């Protein structure tokens, strides 16, 4: 850990070990799962099968190391020949030291002696124990390295000591509450450790004394390389004579995975026992990297009940599927969000410890002289959760901050990403927050100063602290801060971020947070989210409520606004779907009004509620001809302008043709159309207002309620609720809704404007039987004469009119004759005073306003 | 990187010394009728062009259209009343080819910007009244 780095930089001697490992020991690689290895280090899960030469060099190296101090985690496996690794789980009743008296040691030695007499016999007894002061008390580890009998005889001896009783009463003399079971049955089948090798979060043992004796085939300390002597593989000893692998690899080779493992212990039990949270966690892990499977199966094993019952199988059906593809818009940041929500304190100490470890290892590595890059990394690890860097269209890095409550901020940006010219929040965070971490470094340094150490390392420490003190001021220097923020820009940068902003039309920014219309019911996010939201409306969402005074006020206002009921429902649902910023159904609505009607008030209300970022005003000049402005919105609108309104066919042609907004026009007089193509007409709808209000009109509606937040909020809740209602009912397929009044008005308007369509409706009738192959340019002359009797005496003759009629609503019920003529079928021509034959087809007590039936 | 240097086409999904910056996001797979989309597209094309020879010739012309080298200097004219699928075919080919090699051209240029076609392998227009 950070302690390991401190100790490595601490010791001038210790370099020999890693130099040997990198230069000479490296070439003798051993496969981790193979049994051939003799020396194993669990620090990184390395196994080695070195011969005795470098074995004794590393033994002496560890001897000098333990002379100087430090901590080791080295392990060895007993081979076919080995000494006696015996581990005693002496969990005494009380934590009172049972000092190992020489009589007890001698009696234990004689006991194990007579255990080994009734076996293969042709000796040094060395004693070590725990430092005590720990739950489970101490343990004893006696070694008998003289002999080499690692075979089934060892299992027989283990079985005998399981049933041995003299050792039991010896333990009773030591006040041990467990006469047996302290012996691990796998004592000789698991790897052991050399002297000085500590456990995880546990100090290494200490030696009390080392005795020796001799066994006869007929008659029944600090002056030796003791580490080499204790070695089972050391045949050339001087004093003694020869008488879940993936999980471990991933944990030991990935620090961030280790931190995630640490914080997963803080997760509440519901995460790994229920499908939603566990699935989201594995989605985040897949987003992290597909290499982190073993931690995923470990999380599954945290709930063995479900893990056995398909939990591993479901993870394979989830982790691998997610590995191939994860559609969860989530990252690690969500994991830290949950961790801080559930265990905020332990979260705080964990993150503080991580930051301290990073800073301290950097200080130790670089002699306490920091620089832009280390500061940038530390600040990244500390507060990378609310800043993103992306290059603009002009090649300039642009900053963004994630708005959180409790800071100076405008109305409506809460729980959203907002742009800053300069990272001033970062520019004060680096000045203040990092200061406490640097103070932690300083107090750590003087804490080691308080401990009594070797003089040269102490001088090293004074030089280190003096250099770090010289480095204090640069955290405050402005130019240094500019370099640091440059480094952060090159660190915080997230590729492919700007163009992804506000992509999904299922998210809208509201005053009180973020609302999602993904599914019914809608969820209004009022907390941190990975979702990146910049655009928003000042209006804050409100839970829809029927009994609210403003709700019923607006219900009555809408009911009086539209005398019709079903047409009111249709137009209301359409304007509700107008919120959708995605691909609309490409329809146009024309609304009339003679003044003092409030239709302009409705337009202003919806524009104000939706806001500028999604609604923009459109001029009649563009349509009668800023065209790029209407793209990117969700709703467009116009205003009444005189009485000479006129269009351009091409402009609406690309309007009725990317486009992802809603288009509605309002005026005071009937519009003038000069087109006949059905492609234009089918995307057009019209309505005319019937009721007028006079001094009854409410001036407060146009003045007070026009700018009353409550009305807007209530209106927003109404419209989102009706979006939800239609999505439940029609799934967004607005065309399915029946609007007889609107369709009749549109048909009448087309007959008024489209003279060709009027002729088609009147004098062209589809006969229920027979054929109309006689339809030729004679029909052209027929409608020319009709125009003479209807619109213009001028003779209208052009085959391109027939071509566009084919392109018109007459496209259906057609046929290509063998001669490819414009011949009809089952139709007749109505001359003057000619009548179409039969069969000639032409060519709730206000609670419904709140919520009408799906089938009214 | 897909190369039509020599038949059969070879997709270099590894290192290569060919210098390329332009691209289309569409990934390549060998053709096969097994794909329901493949059969559906071929049936839709057959419905669009009941004639055999004309369908083959125009499909070959579109196949050659992917070549950003010199062509035979020929012009193709296509007519249809609307919503007949020819708009669907032109939109499909435009989307498949992408911006870097396909571009829509306004009728204003031809009825009278004209240098914007440089770097394109295929150009087209749209119906305007």
XYZ file of N, CA and C in Angstrom, chain A residues 248-464:
651
model
N -7.882 -13.360 -7.509
C -6.671 -12.908 -6.836
C -5.786 -12.104 -7.778
N -5.641 -12.561 -9.024
C -4.807 -11.845 -9.986
C -5.358 -10.445 -10.227
N -6.674 -10.341 -10.427
C -7.287 -9.044 -10.688
C -7.173 -8.117 -9.484
N -7.430 -8.635 -8.279
C -7.346 -7.796 -7.088
C -5.921 -7.316 -6.843
N -4.940 -8.204 -7.002
C -3.549 -7.878 -6.717
C -2.878 -7.067 -7.818
N -3.513 -6.915 -8.980
C -2.901 -6.223 -10.109
C -3.696 -5.003 -10.558
N -4.732 -4.616 -9.821
C -5.554 -3.485 -10.230
C -6.014 -2.707 -9.002
N -5.429 -1.533 -8.741
C -5.789 -0.804 -7.512
C -7.226 -0.315 -7.494
N -7.729 0.207 -8.616
C -9.105 0.691 -8.640
C -10.094 -0.449 -8.430
N -9.794 -1.634 -8.967
C -10.623 -2.799 -8.674
C -10.598 -3.121 -7.186
N -9.440 -2.952 -6.545
C -9.353 -3.168 -5.105
C -10.219 -2.171 -4.344
N -10.210 -0.904 -4.769
C -11.047 0.098 -4.114
C -12.528 -0.201 -4.313
N -12.908 -0.632 -5.518
C -14.292 -1.031 -5.754
C -14.677 -2.227 -4.893
N -13.761 -3.181 -4.719
C -14.028 -4.301 -3.823
C -14.224 -3.822 -2.390
N -13.402 -2.867 -1.949
C -13.552 -2.324 -0.603
C -14.908 -1.652 -0.426
N -15.325 -0.846 -1.405
C -16.589 -0.127 -1.274
C -17.797 -1.030 -1.486
N -17.637 -2.154 -2.187
C -18.748 -3.085 -2.351
C -19.167 -3.689 -1.020
N -18.246 -3.748 -0.053
C -18.611 -4.188 1.289
C -19.605 -3.231 1.934
N -19.596 -1.963 1.519
C -20.531 -0.972 2.035
C -21.908 -1.062 1.393
N -22.046 -1.805 0.302
C -23.336 -1.910 -0.359
C -24.328 -2.650 0.536
N -25.575 -2.197 0.599
C -26.579 -2.883 1.415
C -26.912 -4.243 0.832
N -27.456 -5.157 1.641
C -27.705 -6.522 1.147
C -28.642 -6.593 -0.046
N -29.574 -5.646 -0.185
C -30.549 -5.718 -1.269
C -29.903 -5.671 -2.648
N -28.663 -5.189 -2.751
C -28.019 -5.075 -4.056
C -27.808 -6.440 -4.702
N -27.181 -7.367 -3.984
C -26.823 -8.656 -4.563
C -27.897 -9.722 -4.385
N -29.000 -9.414 -3.707
C -30.069 -10.386 -3.527
C -31.244 -10.145 -4.467
N -31.382 -8.949 -5.034
C -32.473 -8.641 -5.943
C -31.922 -8.320 -7.325
N -32.711 -8.652 -8.346
C -32.246 -8.510 -9.726
C -31.931 -7.074 -10.128
N -32.772 -6.052 -9.831
C -32.493 -4.704 -10.357
C -31.123 -4.142 -9.999
N -30.812 -4.062 -8.703
C -29.559 -3.439 -8.284
C -28.349 -4.244 -8.741
N -28.407 -5.572 -8.615
C -27.304 -6.410 -9.074
C -27.086 -6.264 -10.575
N -28.176 -6.220 -11.344
C -28.070 -6.034 -12.786
C -27.464 -4.681 -13.125
N -27.880 -3.626 -12.424
C -27.297 -2.312 -12.679
C -25.814 -2.294 -12.326
N -25.440 -2.970 -11.239
C -24.036 -3.037 -10.846
C -23.217 -3.756 -11.911
N -23.727 -4.879 -12.423
C -22.969 -5.601 -13.442
C -22.945 -4.816 -14.751
N -23.990 -4.031 -15.035
C -23.943 -3.134 -16.188
C -22.826 -2.111 -16.037
N -22.710 -1.508 -14.852
C -21.637 -0.547 -14.617
C -20.271 -1.213 -14.722
N -20.154 -2.447 -14.225
C -18.892 -3.172 -14.331
C -18.537 -3.457 -15.786
N -19.529 -3.839 -16.593
C -19.284 -4.057 -18.015
C -18.870 -2.765 -18.705
N -19.516 -1.652 -18.351
C -19.096 -0.357 -18.877
C -17.660 -0.046 -18.482
N -17.259 -0.455 -17.279
C -15.893 -0.254 -16.817
C -14.912 -0.996 -17.714
N -14.995 -2.323 -17.712
C -14.145 -3.179 -18.528
C -14.674 -4.602 -18.445
N -14.556 -5.331 -19.553
C -14.927 -6.740 -19.573
C -13.921 -7.623 -18.848
N -12.763 -7.078 -18.471
C -11.750 -7.836 -17.749
C -12.098 -8.043 -16.282
N -13.158 -7.403 -15.785
C -13.510 -7.445 -14.371
C -14.593 -8.474 -14.068
N -14.591 -9.596 -14.786
C -15.509 -10.686 -14.459
C -15.308 -11.232 -13.050
N -14.089 -11.581 -12.605
C -13.967 -12.242 -11.292
C -14.587 -11.455 -10.154
N -14.493 -10.125 -10.182
C -15.187 -9.330 -9.175
C -16.699 -9.444 -9.332
N -17.181 -9.640 -10.561
C -18.615 -9.828 -10.762
C -19.088 -11.140 -10.146
N -18.356 -12.231 -10.390
C -18.722 -13.487 -9.735
C -18.524 -13.414 -8.225
N -17.579 -12.597 -7.753
C -17.442 -12.411 -6.309
C -18.652 -11.683 -5.734
N -19.145 -10.669 -6.445
C -20.364 -9.990 -6.025
C -21.544 -10.952 -6.019
N -21.601 -11.847 -7.007
C -22.634 -12.879 -7.007
C -22.490 -13.807 -5.806
N -21.258 -14.223 -5.500
C -20.995 -15.097 -4.363
C -21.263 -14.410 -3.033
N -21.312 -13.076 -3.019
C -21.766 -12.368 -1.828
C -23.185 -12.764 -1.441
N -23.957 -13.302 -2.385
C -25.274 -13.878 -2.123
C -25.266 -15.302 -2.662
N -24.677 -16.244 -1.919
C -24.595 -17.627 -2.419
C -25.949 -18.268 -2.660
N -26.977 -17.864 -1.909
C -28.306 -18.447 -2.076
C -28.799 -18.297 -3.510
N -28.762 -17.073 -4.037
C -29.142 -16.858 -5.427
C -28.035 -17.262 -6.391
N -26.770 -17.140 -5.973
C -25.658 -17.454 -6.865
C -25.681 -18.917 -7.287
N -25.937 -19.823 -6.343
C -26.070 -21.232 -6.691
C -27.300 -21.472 -7.559
N -28.413 -20.810 -7.242
C -29.660 -20.983 -7.989
C -29.684 -20.029 -9.183
N -28.762 -20.277 -10.110
C -28.706 -19.533 -11.349
C -28.028 -18.184 -11.273
N -27.571 -17.761 -10.093
C -26.916 -16.465 -9.989
C -25.673 -16.377 -10.850
N -24.826 -17.406 -10.794
C -23.725 -17.493 -11.747
C -24.252 -17.592 -13.171
N -25.287 -18.410 -13.379
C -25.857 -18.572 -14.713
C -26.485 -17.278 -15.213
N -27.231 -16.577 -14.352
C -27.812 -15.304 -14.764
C -26.737 -14.254 -15.014
N -25.664 -14.264 -14.218
C -24.549 -13.357 -14.473
C -23.918 -13.640 -15.829
N -23.745 -14.918 -16.168
C -23.299 -15.264 -17.514
C -24.283 -14.752 -18.558
N -25.579 -14.850 -18.271
C -26.603 -14.256 -19.119
C -26.665 -12.739 -18.996
N -25.962 -12.147 -18.029
C -25.916 -10.695 -17.897
C -24.521 -10.140 -18.147
N -23.506 -10.604 -17.411
C -22.170 -10.024 -17.532
C -21.616 -10.192 -18.941
N -21.765 -11.386 -19.517
C -21.281 -11.606 -20.876
C -22.096 -10.805 -21.884
N -23.414 -10.828 -21.734
C -24.261 -10.044 -22.619
C -23.876 -8.585 -22.489
N -23.734 -8.116 -21.255
C -23.325 -6.736 -21.030
C -21.925 -6.520 -21.576
N -21.055 -7.508 -21.392
C -19.699 -7.399 -21.907
C -19.759 -7.174 -23.403
N -20.595 -7.944 -24.092
C -20.759 -7.745 -25.524
C -21.359 -6.378 -25.770
N -22.359 -6.017 -24.975
C -23.028 -4.736 -25.156
C -23.785 -4.326 -23.905
N -23.569 -3.100 -23.446
C -24.303 -2.605 -22.287
C -25.054 -1.341 -22.663
N -26.373 -1.361 -22.514
C -27.180 -0.208 -22.902
C -27.500 0.675 -21.707
N -26.854 0.409 -20.577
C -27.101 1.198 -19.378
C -26.299 2.489 -19.404
N -26.989 3.621 -19.491
C -26.309 4.911 -19.486
C -25.790 5.185 -18.092
N -24.869 4.352 -17.627
C -24.349 4.488 -16.273
C -22.844 4.270 -16.292
N -22.173 4.793 -15.266
C -20.733 4.654 -15.088
C -20.440 4.360 -13.622
N -19.150 4.378 -13.275
C -18.753 4.217 -11.880
C -19.323 5.328 -11.012
N -19.514 6.513 -11.596
C -20.006 7.659 -10.843
C -21.330 7.345 -10.162
N -22.188 6.560 -10.818
C -23.413 6.101 -10.173
C -23.102 5.227 -8.964
N -22.075 4.380 -9.068
C -21.708 3.518 -7.947
C -21.264 4.357 -6.756
N -20.420 5.366 -6.999
C -20.030 6.241 -5.896
C -21.212 7.042 -5.365
N -22.158 7.415 -6.230
C -23.358 8.109 -5.770
C -24.147 7.243 -4.794
N -24.378 5.979 -5.158
C -25.075 5.068 -4.253
C -24.293 4.862 -2.963
N -22.973 4.684 -3.069
C -22.162 4.447 -1.880
C -22.226 5.629 -0.923
N -22.144 6.851 -1.454
C -22.251 8.032 -0.608
C -23.655 8.187 -0.039
N -24.682 7.785 -0.793
C -26.041 7.823 -0.262
C -26.203 6.876 0.920
N -25.650 5.666 0.816
C -25.902 4.648 1.832
C -24.955 4.776 3.019
N -23.653 4.856 2.761
C -22.636 4.913 3.811
C -21.790 6.164 3.618
N -22.374 7.348 3.841
C -21.638 8.591 3.548
C -20.344 8.740 4.327
N -20.328 8.338 5.599
C -19.120 8.484 6.405
C -17.992 7.626 5.849
N -18.173 6.303 5.874
C -17.146 5.399 5.367
C -16.738 5.772 3.949
N -17.690 6.253 3.148
C -17.356 6.819 1.845
C -16.350 7.957 1.985
N -16.579 8.850 2.953
C -15.691 9.994 3.135
C -14.291 9.550 3.543
N -14.194 8.653 4.529
C -12.862 8.175 4.912
C -12.187 7.411 3.777
N -12.946 6.636 3.000
C -12.346 5.883 1.900
C -11.766 6.829 0.855
N -12.541 7.837 0.449
C -12.048 8.747 -0.579
C -10.890 9.584 -0.043
N -10.967 10.008 1.222
C -9.868 10.766 1.810
C -8.599 9.929 1.876
N -8.727 8.654 2.251
C -7.571 7.769 2.302
C -6.976 7.560 0.919
N -7.824 7.389 -0.097
C -7.307 7.245 -1.450
C -6.550 8.476 -1.912
N -7.127 9.657 -1.673
C -6.459 10.895 -2.062
C -5.133 11.044 -1.330
N -5.131 10.749 -0.027
C -3.911 10.836 0.761
C -2.852 9.867 0.259
N -3.246 8.636 -0.067
C -2.286 7.661 -0.569
C -1.669 8.135 -1.876
N -2.502 8.642 -2.787
C -1.996 9.129 -4.068
C -1.004 10.267 -3.850
N -1.404 11.263 -3.057
C -0.543 12.419 -2.840
C 0.750 12.028 -2.134
N 0.660 11.153 -1.130
C 1.841 10.766 -0.369
C 2.813 9.962 -1.217
N 2.307 9.036 -2.039
C 3.212 8.287 -2.900
C 3.861 9.195 -3.933
N 3.127 10.192 -4.439
C 3.748 11.144 -5.355
C 4.834 11.952 -4.655
N 4.555 12.421 -3.437
C 5.535 13.214 -2.700
C 6.787 12.396 -2.423
N 6.611 11.162 -1.944
C 7.755 10.303 -1.657
C 8.547 10.001 -2.922
N 7.850 9.721 -4.026
C 8.528 9.359 -5.267
C 9.376 10.508 -5.799
N 8.848 11.732 -5.752
C 9.485 12.874 -6.394
C 10.085 13.855 -5.394
N 10.517 13.369 -4.229
C 11.267 14.168 -3.262
C 10.475 15.377 -2.778
N 9.149 15.277 -2.790
C 8.315 16.356 -2.311
C 8.243 17.565 -3.213
N 8.653 17.441 -4.473
C 8.566 18.530 -5.442
C 7.448 18.188 -6.418
N 6.288 18.807 -6.221
C 5.131 18.539 -7.058
C 5.234 19.318 -8.368
N 4.261 19.102 -9.247
C 4.224 19.767 -10.541
C 2.787 19.727 -11.047
N 2.568 20.339 -12.214
C 1.222 20.461 -12.768
C 0.526 19.109 -12.871
N 1.250 18.081 -13.314
C 0.599 16.829 -13.685
C 0.130 16.053 -12.457
N 0.958 15.984 -11.411
C 0.533 15.309 -10.188
C -0.647 16.025 -9.545
N -0.605 17.359 -9.518
C -1.725 18.127 -8.984
C -2.984 17.850 -9.787
N -2.855 17.804 -11.114
C -4.009 17.529 -11.959
C -4.587 16.153 -11.670
N -3.728 15.144 -11.508
C -4.230 13.803 -11.220
C -4.930 13.757 -9.868
N -4.355 14.419 -8.862
C -4.959 14.420 -7.532
C -6.320 15.103 -7.569
N -6.397 16.257 -8.235
C -7.659 16.981 -8.325
C -8.674 16.187 -9.135
N -8.216 15.481 -10.170
C -9.102 14.605 -10.924
C -9.707 13.558 -10.002
N -8.853 12.805 -9.307
C -9.344 11.762 -8.414
C -10.249 12.330 -7.330
N -10.020 13.579 -6.924
C -10.821 14.162 -5.854
C -12.200 14.580 -6.352
N -12.251 15.401 -7.398
C -13.494 16.053 -7.801
C -13.683 15.998 -9.314
N -13.474 14.823 -9.908
C -13.813 14.676 -11.305
C -15.262 14.363 -11.584
N -16.126 14.477 -10.581
C -17.515 14.069 -10.709
C -18.438 15.198 -11.143
N -17.919 16.414 -11.328
C -18.769 17.512 -11.771
C -18.084 18.416 -12.790
N -17.154 17.890 -13.585
C -16.470 18.683 -14.600
C -16.143 17.813 -15.803
N -16.391 18.345 -16.997
C -16.099 17.659 -18.250
C -15.506 18.665 -19.224
N -14.531 18.219 -20.010
C -13.850 19.059 -20.989
C -14.098 18.484 -22.375
N -14.505 19.342 -23.307
C -14.694 18.945 -24.693
C -14.325 20.106 -25.603
N -13.760 19.769 -26.759
C -13.334 20.772 -27.728
C -14.541 21.226 -28.537
N -14.710 22.541 -28.658
C -15.843 23.098 -29.381
C -15.656 22.912 -30.887
N -16.617 23.431 -31.654
C -16.513 23.390 -33.107
C -15.376 24.256 -33.632
N -14.906 25.221 -32.844
C -13.836 26.118 -33.257
C -12.462 25.675 -32.778
N -12.364 24.527 -32.112
C -11.077 24.055 -31.642
C -10.653 24.590 -30.294
N -11.604 24.972 -29.446
C -11.318 25.503 -28.122
C -11.916 24.588 -27.066
N -11.125 24.284 -26.041
C -11.620 23.483 -24.931
C -12.664 24.266 -24.146
N -13.761 23.594 -23.808
C -14.889 24.218 -23.128
C -15.186 23.436 -21.856
N -15.357 24.157 -20.754
C -15.620 23.562 -19.452
C -17.117 23.505 -19.179
N -17.514 22.561 -18.328
C -18.881 22.445 -17.842
C -18.859 21.975 -16.394
N -19.844 22.418 -15.619
C -19.973 22.048 -14.217
C -21.353 21.462 -13.961
N -21.409 20.466 -13.079
C -22.663 19.820 -12.711
C -23.259 20.568 -11.525
N -24.389 21.238 -11.755
C -24.986 22.091 -10.735
C -25.524 21.240 -9.594
N -25.211 21.640 -8.366
C -25.685 20.983 -7.160
C -26.280 22.015 -6.213
N -27.232 21.612 -5.371
C -27.857 22.574 -4.456
C -26.866 23.115 -3.437
N -27.124 24.339 -2.985
C -26.307 24.975 -1.975
C -25.226 25.899 -2.488
N -25.268 26.283 -3.754
C -24.274 27.147 -4.368
C -24.969 28.295 -5.079
N -24.278 29.418 -5.269
C -24.840 30.493 -6.097
C -25.118 29.996 -7.507
N -26.371 30.137 -7.931
C -26.817 29.565 -9.192
C -28.163 30.160 -9.571
N -28.362 30.368 -10.870
C -29.596 30.952 -11.364
C -30.753 29.974 -11.198
N -31.968 30.495 -11.320
C -33.147 29.647 -11.219
C -33.228 28.704 -12.417
N -33.412 27.412 -12.142
C -33.700 26.435 -13.174
C -32.544 25.582 -13.656
N -31.307 25.880 -13.263
C -30.169 25.066 -13.682
C -29.855 23.919 -12.730
N -30.671 23.692 -11.699
C -30.352 22.660 -10.719
C -30.339 21.288 -11.386
N -29.439 20.422 -10.911
C -29.281 19.067 -11.444
C -29.038 19.083 -12.952
N -28.162 19.980 -13.398
C -27.880 20.133 -14.817
C -26.424 20.523 -15.018
N -25.958 20.337 -16.249
C -24.633 20.774 -16.658
C -24.728 22.188 -17.214
N -23.887 23.084 -16.705
C -23.854 24.459 -17.180
C -22.434 24.816 -17.596
N -22.325 25.667 -18.610
C -21.031 26.038 -19.160
C -20.430 27.210 -18.394
N -19.107 27.183 -18.252
C -18.354 28.272 -17.647
C -17.222 28.682 -18.575
N -16.978 29.990 -18.659
C -15.853 30.485 -19.446
C -14.540 29.988 -18.861
N -14.406 30.052 -17.541
C -13.245 29.542 -16.834
C -13.714 28.732 -15.636
N -12.972 27.692 -15.260
C -13.365 26.863 -14.101
C -13.052 27.547 -12.775
N -13.785 28.628 -12.501
C -13.575 29.374 -11.265
C -13.873 28.511 -10.045
N -14.920 27.686 -10.124
C -15.205 26.752 -9.041
C -14.022 25.817 -8.820
N -13.474 25.265 -9.905
C -12.232 24.507 -9.798
C -11.092 25.390 -9.312
N -11.064 26.646 -9.759
C -9.961 27.535 -9.421
C -9.940 27.907 -7.944
N -11.048 27.717 -7.229
C -11.066 27.967 -5.792
C -10.997 26.635 -5.056
N -11.508 25.574 -5.689
C -11.389 24.239 -5.116
C -9.929 23.841 -4.971
N -9.124 24.086 -6.005
C -7.705 23.749 -5.940
C -7.014 24.551 -4.846
N -7.457 25.788 -4.623
C -6.820 26.620 -3.608
C -7.180 26.162 -2.200
N -8.427 25.742 -1.983
C -8.898 25.450 -0.630
C -8.873 23.961 -0.292
N -9.577 23.136 -1.071
C -9.746 21.733 -0.705
C -8.417 20.991 -0.695
N -7.590 21.205 -1.719
C -6.289 20.552 -1.782
C -5.399 20.941 -0.611
N -5.653 22.101 0.001
C -4.835 22.542 1.125
C -4.955 21.590 2.306
N -6.161 21.088 2.582
C -6.320 20.152 3.690
C -5.600 18.837 3.417
N -5.624 18.366 2.170
C -4.889 17.150 1.828
C -3.391 17.367 1.994
N -2.896 18.522 1.552
C -1.475 18.815 1.702
C -1.102 18.933 3.177
N -2.005 19.488 3.987
C -1.805 19.523 5.431
C -1.758 18.117 6.013
N -2.595 17.216 5.493
C -2.531 15.819 5.908
C -1.166 15.226 5.595
N -0.637 15.523 4.409
C 0.711 15.074 4.059
C 1.725 15.602 5.069
N 1.629 16.893 5.395
C 2.587 17.502 6.315
C 2.522 16.858 7.695
N 1.310 16.660 8.222
C 1.194 16.062 9.549
C 1.641 14.610 9.538
N 1.424 13.902 8.431
C 1.982 12.564 8.272
C 3.505 12.587 8.353
N 4.122 13.563 7.686
C 5.579 13.657 7.685
C 6.100 13.944 9.089
N 5.493 14.913 9.783
C 5.954 15.202 11.140
C 5.567 14.109 12.132
N 4.552 13.301 11.819
C 4.244 12.138 12.641
C 5.373 11.122 12.571
N 5.829 10.808 11.353
C 7.043 9.998 11.231
C 8.251 10.671 11.872
N 8.317 12.003 11.843
C 9.384 12.689 12.570
C 9.310 12.384 14.062
N 8.096 12.350 14.618
C 7.931 12.078 16.043
C 8.384 10.672 16.415
N 8.309 9.723 15.488
C 8.761 8.364 15.776
C 10.284 8.307 15.740
N 10.932 7.598 16.670
C 12.401 7.516 16.651
C 12.923 6.627 15.532
N 13.754 7.175 14.648
C 14.252 6.440 13.492
C 15.773 6.557 13.378
N 16.300 5.995 12.292
C 17.715 6.119 11.966
C 18.022 7.526 11.462
N 19.204 8.025 11.837
C 19.514 9.444 11.671
C 19.518 9.870 10.205
N 20.097 9.053 9.322
C 20.186 9.437 7.915
C 18.804 9.562 7.286
N 17.897 8.640 7.614
C 16.535 8.732 7.101
C 15.835 9.955 7.680
N 16.166 10.314 8.921
C 15.623 11.538 9.498
C 16.095 12.772 8.735
N 17.379 12.816 8.365
C 17.875 13.923 7.548
C 17.186 13.948 6.191
N 17.004 12.771 5.591
C 16.181 12.651 4.394
C 14.819 13.293 4.604
N 14.212 13.048 5.765
C 12.884 13.587 6.037
C 12.901 15.101 6.197
N 13.921 15.653 6.859
C 14.010 17.112 6.917
C 14.170 17.716 5.528
N 15.005 17.112 4.680
C 15.140 17.619 3.315
C 13.820 17.507 2.557
N 13.114 16.389 2.736
C 11.831 16.177 2.077
C 10.819 17.235 2.491
